[PDB]
Ligand binder design. Structure first.
Ligand SMILES: *[C@@H]1O[C@H](CO)[C@@H](O[C@@H]2O[C@H](CO)[C@@H](O[C@@H]3O[C@H](CO[C@H]4O[C@H](CO[C@H]5O[C@H](CO)[C@@H](O)[C@H](O)[C@@H]5O)[C@@H](O)[C@H](O[C@H]5O[C@H](CO)[C@@H](O)[C@H](O)[C@@H]5O[C@H]5O[C@H](CO)[C@@H](O)[C@H](O)[C@@H]5O)[C@@H]4O)[C@@H](O)[C@H](O[C@H]4O[C@H](CO)[C@@H](O)[C@H](O)[C@@H]4O[C@H]4O[C@H](CO)[C@@H](O)[C@H](O)[C@@H]4O[C@H]4O[C@H](CO)[C@@H](O)[C@H](O)[C@@H]4O)[C@@H]3O)[C@H](O)[C@H]2NC(C)=O)[C@H](O)[C@H]1NC(C)=O
Ligand SMILES: CCCCCCCC/C=C/CCCCCCCC(=O)O[C@H](COC(=O)CCCCCCCCCCCCCCC)COP(=O)(O)OC[C@@H](O)CO
Ligand SMILES: CCCCCCCC/C=C\CCCCCCCC(=O)O[C@H](COC(=O)CCCCCCCCCCCCCCC)COP(=O)(O)OC[C@@H](O)CO
Ligand SMILES: CCCCCCCC/C=C\CCCCCCCC(=O)O[C@H](COC(=O)CCCCCCCCCCCCCCC)COP(=O)(O)OC[C@@H](O)CO
Ligand SMILES: CCCCCCCC/C=C\CCCCCCCC(=O)O[C@H](COC(=O)CCCCCCCCCCCCCCC)COP(=O)(O)OC[C@@H](O)CO
Ligand SMILES: *[C@@H]1O[C@H](CO)[C@@H](O[C@@H]2O[C@H](CO)[C@@H](O[C@@H]3O[C@H](CO[C@H]4O[C@H](CO)[C@@H](O)[C@H](O)[C@@H]4O)[C@@H](O)[C@H](O)[C@@H]3O)[C@H](O)[C@H]2NC(C)=O)[C@H](O)[C@H]1NC(C)=O
Ligand SMILES: *[C@@H]1O[C@H](CO)[C@@H](O[C@@H]2O[C@H](CO)[C@@H](O[C@@H]3O[C@H](CO)[C@@H](O)[C@H](O)[C@@H]3O)[C@H](O)[C@H]2NC(C)=O)[C@H](O)[C@H]1NC(C)=O
Ligand SMILES: CCCCCCCCCCCC(=O)OC[C@H](COP(=O)([O-])O)OC(=O)CCCCCCCCCCC
Ligand SMILES: CCCCCCCCCCCCCCCC(=O)O
Ligand SMILES: CCCCCCCCCCCCCCCC(=O)O
Ligand SMILES: CCCCCCCCCCCCCCCC(=O)O
Ligand SMILES: *[C@@H]1O[C@H](CO)[C@@H](O)[C@H](O)[C@H]1NC(C)=O
Ligand SMILES: CCCCCC
Lengths: 48, 290, 121, 348, 264, 176, 232
């Protein structure tokens, strides 16, 4: 979505789009951290 | 012990299975009855229906009398095929199956007095002609008719073991119908005068009534709502020419789609059903609104 | 309209034949039957014949009355033999698929005018 | 020659396998595949026609003579011991009996028996329809002796194990025959341990029909949905009709996505592509709806409201939503296609 | 190899197929095993399901006991036509067959103590009553009922060999539409006027998968309804736009409904 | 044997539905109950306003007219039950019987033939295939009574009538 | 064929054998190489006839419904043509044991009935009859081959598929002749012609064997769809 929001650089003010990707990348990083922390929790599975 | 094998070996001595019991001096009387384990699907496309039955007949053959400590004698299928049994067949059958898994699903018991009891497990597809004038509001009486193929009325006569109503017993769980409801059975007997002679025909009639809720929710109600949209066209201001034209023509297209879908899932009938008349009137109403 | 005309005699000392001609619809796939009504308002099943040419008869008239159908003409005939004085009644011709019936008048949708029969000894 | 056959059949008990007390009966198997029939993905099965040949040794059938080989039709096939071979994953299999039984039996003087027959087998193949229509499968055909465990019958593949014909005369509509392989395993059952052998045929689906029929039309419908963004605002009937009728066209197109497949309860690649295109056209229509509604009517630098969340003015500029959607929608669709196609072809 | 030949010939010499093991004695106990190779089809219209299995029956026959050959005699399946075997049959069966390629998929194995193991590869269509009022959110129950046609409990008795582990291969079954939540084995004696007849019952509970209907039925309808709500935000005077949107949403819902009617 | 059959079988429940009846004079009656699918070359160019002509041919496999002759016992009354037939979609207009010797070059072989002339019933098609097409064609003429300037209305009407005709044609191709 | 063991003498010249006796005599194990589930009719009795001439010449006639494989390459559908084969020969006997030949000249030894064409889709142009040898791991086998040449009928697809597609394309191009200000009207042309082409494409593809490669009709429909999209 941020790579898509690179398109907004034509019209919108540069600062607000930079902040939009900033918040979007921060949220993406938070999701990636949550995934990496939750993934070892599932190692108890009978297949694993 | 030796008594069983001796009686089994000595029963068929001089027995001619080409001749019916009491040939030329009496009429072979067959007491028959049926236990319907499941009233199979009814295919209105093919005008047929499947039925699984424990079909058991009984008669008397004095040629097979015997004496011993035992009053009942079980015959294996090889020997059961070596003696005369009725040539019962289903008049309106299309393709019936005698079950053979794991061994022939039939049994033959003999009493010391010569009474034979012959039980079979069968799956019979039978013709059910249908009057679809009042479809989907219609009801039918699908028949199941059987009798001797070769022996006329003066040689073999079939009868019901018990009262005819109680001689065809349907299992409580044995109603495998999606479209219909099995209201009940009517058991009867009659005579057919064929080109070869008179024959006794034992008949059952299973009474079926089609369920209507599916056609109400799928066809009647959406068609009525489409028509109601067609009259709702009238309440828009007359100056909305493109709006009302689009409304009418797209309502006609919707009605056409509904008609196609309604008929696509139905048997290929020539004359018109009640569903067809309702759909045609709905066409007329949307067309007249436009 | 669908109509079921009846033809046949009304007086006999005997043997008789009562025919029924159906007009307005083809009853090839329907069951065609005969009913009797003596004075007292009680209708009695006599005979019926099916698309499969299978003949059903009532106990009172088994072996006496014979039912036949001409599918080409779309008609049903009843040959009456061994008449008795007690057989005097009005005979009705009926047609319709036998639902819950084949021996009940409620299962037949089509009926005719009827024909009177009297026997004198 | 009739004397030889009569002598061989004398005192011969076909109920007993050769070497019943001595050692396992070794059988050498060969297959010639006339045609791998159509792959019926609905019932998870595929048809295959084979010439199946089995070679073994029977000491009881040794004969000393100058003939050195007896070539025979099916007449004696029932008169001698035959292996109990059956196909484990065969839903339905049939032999051939026109004009006569399609069977052959050759017996050499040293006791070697070759028994060949033609078979048509509807073999089960559990297809993993993920990545459809980029999916590839390796459908097996397994067989083993029904009654005799590994200690009594052992199968062996020959050098020319499985042979195939032209492979252009085969009945494969959807797939292309990629390759073949054979395997031997020992399978434990309640009866015992059995020498199972499998032949794996590798199949890969063709995408030409799916490319022409659903991928390109769905893409074009998405582009036509984008065309609404260039239509002038206040052309309300035109834009509304365009959006909703493109939605209807995607609804029509999505019907044929699953016509070939069984009712699996997971999203295939085709389903995902169609779903994403449906969301794209839906988003275009919702975008126009929103635009029309809003137009008709401590030490880093500063603080946690100006170094982040833009609470100084921001909405105001909604009139330019078409300008954004003109480039946002093609960018999102192109990025989706880049991740979509790279994922299903190269990474996995 | 010869000694086996005389031994087998002696066993089959004088054997009476008509007489069960211990004809005058107690009932012969017949254990049963099933190995489910596959559950092929589940027809809601016909209300049945197809099932391929290896069906094995174990019993004891003193007539077939032999000595001096310490190994189990796996005989050619044709000998099954000469030996007595139970008259088992599947009560809720509609159409079944024992496979016949390359030879009849049948097994006879004798044991030195007289134990007979009799195996058949059977594909059977079995009737399964279905209650589809909650379809596609329905949990069906489909059973196979095994019974003796002629013999009562005095003559024959059934049991599941291995107990709850008698039936295997159920966990390896994959069905595209269903998931086998669990299976159960029951052994009982149905009592009639003639006598108590033994019966075994295999049962499966099938949970219909919902994801197919989520993607094919529910999400399209929800999205089309959400689009139909878009008219409320369009201006009242835009009659052509609002009418076109509403009537085309109605047409789209009709199209979805009719297509689902045809495919399902 | 039936020359034009494709798949035939004698019914076999509860037993093989055969009948052998010997008469004192020596006459033998041999009865079978047979369900047979028989080929019928249909000319469907006038479909659904078409009459079909379906025959069953009966021949001897390996006997000539000098060894066996066929005839229809009872003449025109040899075949019965046709009057009692009502097909769902056809109506049997007439049935005919003919007995003839095919003069094949080696020798003459007997033959019987039972023909039926089916006439298709059209109420289905009239009510369902012709009526909506006629109504849609009539609705397409509404555009002529609308003003020229009303472009949206006339265009929507015309193109949606075209779409409706397309839908009718495609789905009727699928069903028929 | 000829069987010296069955020679007989008598007043007769040809003696026909019943099925029980015919099953006790060697007959060729002919089978169809590209055959499938095929039927040997036995209604009312087995449709077979074995006759022996006094000099041991056996004539064996059967009535069969052969279902045979015709590999089709439908790239040029519906303008495609095919040569469906029918190959047969001995199963168990190699070229050194049994050799097949045609009773007459090869062209005249496979005779098609004048009114036997039960084809609706195709037209039977003719037949080519030949013979050859097929190699195998078991040995060389004689194979008698026929090839029936079939041409598909094009008129149905023209009236049903090609013509409505062409007319839809013409309707799409008709939009160019209207004034540019009729924005809803021209939008309605464009999108409804797209929808009509979608419906036609789905219908045309529905009644076609499920091949995963693109046929000629698929290319025609794709180009028409592109033309309509381009008009919009
Ligand atoms: C419940 O009930 C069902 C029946 O309703 C039962 O199923 C039945 O099982 C039996 C086996 O137990 C099975 O019989 C055998 O069939 C073999 C031949 O094929 C027959 O089937 C094929 C195909 O059938 C399948 O078709 C479909 C799938 O393709 C589908 O319906 C099914 O899957 C089905 O199984 C069919 O094409 C055949 O048609 C004919 O050709 C045969 C050629 O061999 C011939 O035998 C048949 O009679 C028949 O010919 C007549 O009919 C045709 C037209 O159809 C005419 O053109 C002919 O002129 C004839 O009129 C068959 O139907 C067959 O090989 C087996 O025969 C052997 O049986 C034992 C074997 O040891 C011997 O006692 C026999 O003698 C015989 O063996 C001889 O022949 C073979 C073949 O050459 C040799 O290899 C042997 O060495 C042996 O040779 C010796 O003896 C002969 C004399 O006998 C001598 O001449 C030789 O020189 C030599 O000395 C056997 O008959 C039956 O088909 C099947 N019925 C079905 C399914 O419909 C279930 O099991 C029951 N339930 C349970 C669970 O038990
Ligand atoms: C303005 C101009 C005026 C024009 C005039 C308009 C007139 C309005 C027409 C009404 C049609 C009446 C149809 C009723 C026909 C009679 C049918 C009937 O007896 O009702 C039941 C069927 O319906 C059913 O359950 C199926 C359920 C259908 C109802 C579903 C709720 C829809 C809610 C949406 C609103 C609906 C109302 C709108 C009407 C315009 C019978 O089944 P039952 O129970 O015995 O056993 C279970 C079942 O599976 C077997 O029947
Ligand atoms: C494989 C994956 C493919 C990835 C492809 C991704 C492509 C995604 C789509 C469009 C990108 C659009 C980029 C447009 C950037 C053009 C920005 C521009 O015009 O220049 C100025 C600088 O902006 C800025 O510093 C912002 C810098 C933007 C940088 C983003 C573009 C770089 C793309 C380089 C490609 C590398 C690929 C290599 C992959 C291995 C801003 O203007 P301006 O002052 O007048 O406005 C002020 C206000 O008053 C009115 O706008
Ligand atoms: C062409 C159409 C256009 C595309 C459609 C629009 C795009 C929609 C986007 C994302 C959703 C995609 C979902 C894809 C399907 C997901 C299906 C799935 O895998 O999850 C299921 C769980 O369902 C579940 O608990 C769900 C249980 C039902 C709960 C009700 C859900 C209805 C929605 C509730 C309101 C949401 C409001 C938001 C509205 C926008 C698993 O169980 P199921 O047995 O199947 O596995 C059998 C397994 O065991 C076989 O091995
Ligand atoms: C409104 C004015 C009134 C018009 C009134 C006319 C109405 C519409 C026309 C005809 C309807 C007749 C029914 C259609 C019948 C089908 C036509 C037909 O029979 O001829 C076919 C020719 O195919 C063929 O050349 C294939 C070609 C089909 C015709 C189309 C090709 C030219 C299209 C160029 C595009 C221009 C775009 C316009 C841009 C300005 C085959 O026959 P032939 O004997 O060989 O048997 C071969 C054997 O396989 C069975 O046919
Ligand atoms: C196609 O139709 C044919 C007839 O139109 C079918 O041929 C008939 O096949 C059945 C069984 O398939 C035969 O009936 C059986 O015969 C066996 C053997 O009997 C013979 O052997 C005994 C003992 O050696 C001997 O005593 C007899 O006289 C025979 O020589 C027995 O088990 C029973 O009798 C049983 O009825 C018919 O006999 C046979 N017809 C004729 C005229 O022989 C053919 O099977 C059909 N094709 C199929 C089903 O695929
Ligand atoms: C002939 O067949 C019989 C019957 O299958 C064989 O008897 C059985 O052989 C199995 C496998 O060795 C035995 O299983 C085992 O049981 C022991 C003791 O419980 C356990 O320690 C092992 O780990 C294994 O689970 C089984 O007990 C035995 N007896 C039965 C089933 O009654 C026999 O061995 C076979 N003989 C030959 C020569 O193949
Ligand atoms: C079938 C494919 C056809 C593709 C044809 C694309 C031609 C578009 C050329 C754009 C011309 C242009 O720059 O003027 C339009 C606007 C300028 O803003 P405005 O003042 O006109 O509202 O410009 C913009 O602000 C955004 C213009 C769009 C740029 C992105 C085009 C991507 C097209 C690829 C589609 C697959
Ligand atoms: C449930 C979503 C339906 C689709 C609605 C699309 C058009 C929505 C436009 C914006 C709605 C929110 C604005 C609220 C402002 C107000 O109070 O009116
Ligand atoms: C689809 C297009 C969605 C556009 C979303 C708004 C982009 C940023 C709007 C201006 C930001 C600001 O300066 O307030
Ligand atoms: C121009 C905007 C759209 C961007 C997406 C373009 C890609 C459309 C997908 C076309 C299907 C291509 C199929 C690739 C697989 C193959 O042909 O082997
Ligand atoms: C089949 O197996 C044999 C022996 O195991 C081997 O030589 C041959 O290469 C195999 N076939 C393949 C890999 O295609
Ligand atoms: C300008 C010509 C466009 C052609 C589209 C196929």
């Amino acid at each position: 979505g941020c790579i898509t929001c690179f398109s907004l650089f034509f019209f919108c003010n540069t600062a607000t789009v930079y902040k939009i990707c900033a918040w979007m990348q921060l949220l993406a990083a938070l999701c990636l951290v949550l995934g990496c922390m939750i993934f070892p929790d599932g190692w108890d599975a009978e297949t694993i | 012990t030796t008594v069983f094998t001796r009686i089994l070996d000595r029963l068929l001595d001089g027995y001619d299975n080409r001749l019916r019991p009491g040939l030329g001096e009496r009429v072979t009387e067959v007491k028959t009855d049926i236990f319907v384990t499941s009233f199979g699907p009814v295919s209105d496309h093919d005008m047929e229906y499947t039925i699984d039955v424990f079909f058991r007949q009984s008669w008397k053959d004095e040629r097979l009398k015997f004496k011993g400590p035992m009053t009942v004698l079980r015959l294996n299928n090889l020997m059961a095929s070596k003696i005369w049994t009725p040539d019962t067949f289903f008049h309106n059958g299309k393709k019936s199956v005698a079950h053979n898994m794991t061994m022939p699903n039939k049994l033959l018991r003999i009493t010391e007095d010569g009474t034979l009891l012959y039980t079979m497990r069968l799956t019979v597809r039978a013709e059910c002609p249908m009057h679809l004038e009042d479809f989907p509001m219609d009801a039918h009486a699908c028949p199941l008719k059987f009798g001797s193929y070769a022996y006329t009325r003066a040689e073999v006569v079939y009868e019901w073991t018990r009262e005819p109503a109680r001689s065809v017993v349907v299992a409580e769980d044995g109603s495998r119908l999606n479209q219909y409801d099995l209201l009940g059975q009517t058991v009867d007997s009659g005579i057919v005068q064929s080109s070869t002679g008179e024959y006794v025909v034992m008949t059952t009639h299973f009474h079926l009534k089609r369920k209507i809720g599916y056609f109400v929710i799928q066809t009647y109600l959406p068609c009525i709502m489409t028509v109601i949209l067609s009259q709702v066209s009238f309440w828009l201001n007359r100056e909305s020419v493109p709006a009302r034209t689009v409304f009418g023509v797209t309502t006609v297209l919707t009605m056409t789609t509904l008609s196609i879908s309604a008929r696509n899932s139905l048997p290929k009938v020539a004359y018109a059903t009640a569903m067809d008349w309702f759909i045609a009137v709905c066409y007329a109403f949307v067309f007249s609104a436009l | 309209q669908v109509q079921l005309q009846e033809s046949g005699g009304g007086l006999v000392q005997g043997s008789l034949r009562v025919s029924c001609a159906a007009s307005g619809r083809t009853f090839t796939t329907y069951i065609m039957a005969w009913f009797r009504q003596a004075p007292g308002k009680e209708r009695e099943f006599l005979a019926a014949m099916d698309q499969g040419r299978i003949q059903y008869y009532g106990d009172s008239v088994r072996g006496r009355f014979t039912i036949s159908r001409d599918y080409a003409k779309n008609s049903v005939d009843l040959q009456l033999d061994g008449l008795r004085p007690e057989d005097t009644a009005v005979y009705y011709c009926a047609a319709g698929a036998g639902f819950w019936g084949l021996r009940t008048a409620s299962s037949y949708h089509y009926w005719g005018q009827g024909t009177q029969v009297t026997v004198s000894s | 020659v009739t004397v030889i056959l009569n002598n061989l059949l004398e005192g011969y008990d076909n109920k007993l396998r050769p070497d019943i007390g001595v050692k396992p009966t070794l059988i050498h198997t060969d297959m010639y595949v006339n045609s791998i029939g159509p792959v019926n993905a609905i019932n998870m099965e595929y048809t295959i026609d084979i010439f199946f040949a089995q070679t073994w040794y029977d000491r009881r059938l040794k004969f000393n003579s100058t003939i050195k080989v007896l070539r025979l039709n099916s007449n004696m096939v029932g008169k001698i011991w035959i292996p109990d071979t059956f196909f484990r994953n065969s839903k339905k299999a049939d032999a051939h009996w026109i004009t006569t039984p399609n069977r052959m039996l050759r017996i050499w003087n040293d006791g070697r028996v070759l028994y060949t027959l033609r078979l048509t087998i509807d073999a089960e193949c559990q297809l993993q329809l993920h990545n459809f229509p980029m999916d590839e499968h390796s459908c097996p055909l397994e067989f083993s002796s029904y009654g005799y465990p590994r200690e009594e019958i052992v199968y062996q593949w020959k050098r020319s194990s499985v042979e195939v014909g032209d492979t252009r005369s085969w009945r494969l509509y959807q797939f292309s025959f990629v390759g073949l392989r054979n395997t031997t395993e020992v399978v434990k059952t309640t009866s015992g341990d059995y020498v199972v052998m499998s032949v794996y045929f590798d199949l890969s689906r063709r995408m030409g029909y799916f490319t022409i029929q659903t991928y390109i039309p769905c893409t074009l419908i998405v582009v036509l949905s984008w065309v609404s963004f260039w239509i002038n605002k206040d052309a309300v009937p035109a834009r509304t009709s365009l959006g909703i009728t493109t939605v209807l066209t995607m609804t029509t197109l999505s019907t044929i996505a699953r016509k070939s497949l069984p009712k699996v309860s997971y999203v295939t690649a085709m389903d995902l592509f169609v779903s994403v295109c449906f969301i794209f056209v839906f988003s275009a229509l919702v975008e126009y709806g929103t635009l029309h509604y809003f137009v008709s009517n401590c030490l880093d630098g500063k603080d946690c409201a100006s170094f982040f969340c833009c609470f100084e003015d921001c909405h105001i500029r909604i009139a330019k939503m078409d300008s954004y959607a003109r480039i946002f929608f093609p960018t999102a669709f192109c990025l989706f296609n880049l991740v979509y196609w790279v994922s299903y072809l190269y990474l996995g | 190899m010869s000694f086996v030949k005389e031994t087998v010939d002696k066993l089959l010499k004088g054997y009476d197929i008509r007489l069960r093991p211990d004809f005058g004695g107690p009932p012969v106990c017949v254990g049963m095993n099933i190995d489910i190779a596959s559950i092929d089809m589940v027809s809601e219209v016909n209300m049945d399901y197809t099932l391929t299995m290896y069906f094995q029956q174990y019993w004891r026959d003193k007539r077939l006991a032999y000595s001096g050959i310490p190994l189990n005699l796996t005989l050619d399946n044709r000998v099954a036509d000469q030996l007595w075997v139970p008259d088992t049959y599947f009560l809720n069966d509609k159409k079944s067959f024992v496979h016949g390629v390359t030879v009849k998929n049948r097994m006879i194995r004798l044991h030195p103590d007289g134990t007979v193991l009799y195996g058949l590869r059977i594909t059977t269509t079995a009737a399964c009553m279905m209650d589809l009022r909650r379809y596609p959110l329905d949990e069906q129950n489909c059973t196979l009922e095994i019974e003796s046609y002629g013999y009562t409990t005095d003559d024959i008795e059934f049991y599941w060999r291995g107990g709850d582990k008698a039936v295997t291969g159920v966990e390896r079954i994959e069905l595209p539409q269903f998931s086998i939540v669990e299976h159960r084995l029951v052994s009982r004696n149905v009592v009639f006027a003639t006598g108590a007849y033994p019966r075994l019952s295999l049962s499966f509970r099938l949970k219909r998968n919902i994801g197919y209907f989520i993607l094919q039925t529910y999400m399209p309808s929800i999205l089309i309804t959400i689009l139909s709500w878009v008219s409320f935000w369009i201006n009242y005077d835009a009659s052509a736009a609002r009418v076109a949107l509403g009537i085309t949403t109605v047409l789209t819902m009709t199209t979805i409904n009719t297509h689902l009617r045809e495919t399902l």
